[PDB]
């Protein structure tokens, strides 16, 4: 009751909502992320790939205690780490992970400390892949925190959003496969859907 609101920042509760709302908006993008898969091999998969990274983190908040950052925090990394199905799993899974430590000490989710977030699981995504390859997930990730402008959270998560929109498009002049198959990158496609969905929880 004396806990007011914060125009511009997300409680615990409302973050484990932003990831449930955006695995939700996710699904409708699942077959074309797989159609575009063509790197490291074209199996079409990327899309059910991440959706099941992203359903798995979804089951653990469930779980959880989100009245808690650390258990919101925990849930989303631990989940996700599970649910981590390919290369584009494993990636995503440990992008959150630096996302969650981000979290991890604080109290709500603002937009200094998204931006933060962003930052840190991109770093964390790029630390885990043994050898990364640019015009991927990692370029885009790393350019949505990069990008990442401004203090209330629907700014930074406007910019962040087209900043990765701009890498992705520029994913096939760094990667020759994709070029050769018309395509942007489908793991950085995916990366850009789950920021949009983070937008439309926030909108
Ligand atoms: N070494 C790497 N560096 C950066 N990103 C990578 C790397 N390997 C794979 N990826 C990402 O993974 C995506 C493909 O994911 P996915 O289809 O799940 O992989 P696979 O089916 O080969 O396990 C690629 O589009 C790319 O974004
Ligand atoms: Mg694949
Ligand atoms: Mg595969």
């Not at 770093?123 to 892949?129: D, L, N, P, Q, T």
Request: glycine share 12%; charged share 25%; aromatic share 6%.
């Amino acid at each position: 009751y004396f806990q007011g609101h914060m125009a511009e920042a997300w409680g615990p509760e409302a973050v484990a909502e932003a990831f449930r709302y955006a695995t939700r908006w996710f699904q409708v993008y699942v077959e074309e992320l797989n159609a575009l898969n063509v790197y490291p091999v074209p199996d079409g998969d990327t899309g059910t790939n991440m959706l099941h990274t992203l359903e798995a983190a979804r089951r653990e908040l469930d779980l959880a205690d989100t009245s808690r950052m650390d258990q919101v925090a925990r849930a989303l990394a631990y989940g996700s780490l599970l649910g981590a199905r390919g290369n584009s799993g494993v990636i995503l899974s440990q992008i959150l992970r630096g996302f969650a430590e981000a979290l991890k000490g604080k109290r709500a989710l603002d937009g200094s400390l998204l931006r933060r977030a962003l930052r840190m699981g991109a770093e964390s995504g790029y630390k885990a892949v043994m050898r990364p390859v640019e015009g991927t997930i990692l370029t885009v990730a790393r350019a949505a925190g990069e990008g990442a402008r401004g203090e209330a959270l629907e700014e930074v998560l406007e910019t962040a959003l087209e900043a990765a929109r701009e890498a992705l498009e520029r994913t096939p002049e760094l990667l020759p496969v994709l070029r050769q198959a018309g395509v942007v990158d489908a793991g950085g496609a995916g990366y850009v859907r789950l920021l949009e969905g983070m937008r439309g929880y926030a909108l």
